[PDB]
Amino acid sequence: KVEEVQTMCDVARQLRALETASQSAVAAVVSSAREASEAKERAEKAVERAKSKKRGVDTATEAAARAAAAAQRAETVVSDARKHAADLTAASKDAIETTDESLRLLATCEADEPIRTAAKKCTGAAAEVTSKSLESAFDALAELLPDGADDIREHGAVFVKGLKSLEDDVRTAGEAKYEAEKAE
């Protein structure tokens, strides 16, 4: 029925948005680690300036140690983020293909007009997909199909988990940048 088609469309738009969301999350983490590293470099220069002066060396050194540790933490997140992004893109490839194929068959289905139309107009990706918008989309689809609902929610849970990981990565790297800058 057309409700189901439109609800499947919402899921498909969420799925189609994951590669862009992943790349966006990685780019955010990379910018954070860059900023953290710049704060580290400022603090390490400040140590040398102190050393030349023969004054204030303890406090500069302690601050630089904090900034350096924070940049190191940020750099670890870059590595984790790239892995989380590539895992999530890999995990969803088959789901995108399958869902798209369901919808393209409905668009040409021997199906009434609103159903062909809802399927045909289902092109493009959602904007600003989050673990929350993705979970909601799968919940909505599960709700229409009680015989298949447990399965649909578990299919979705994979992507919800992977997106939550990248969202945590973004936070973790942002916290590391924030400490690096506060230290310096």
The CATH fold assigned to 1-184 is Ferritin (1.20.1260)
Exposure letters 66-102 (e unless 16+ CB within 10 A, then b): bbbebbebbbebbebbbebbebbbeebeebbeebeeb
Task: Work out the angle between the directed axes of helices 113-120 and 2-16 (0-180°, nearest 10).
Answer: 0
The token duo for 120 is 């045909």
Method: X-ray
Phi, psi of 166, rounded to the nearest 5 degrees: -70, -35
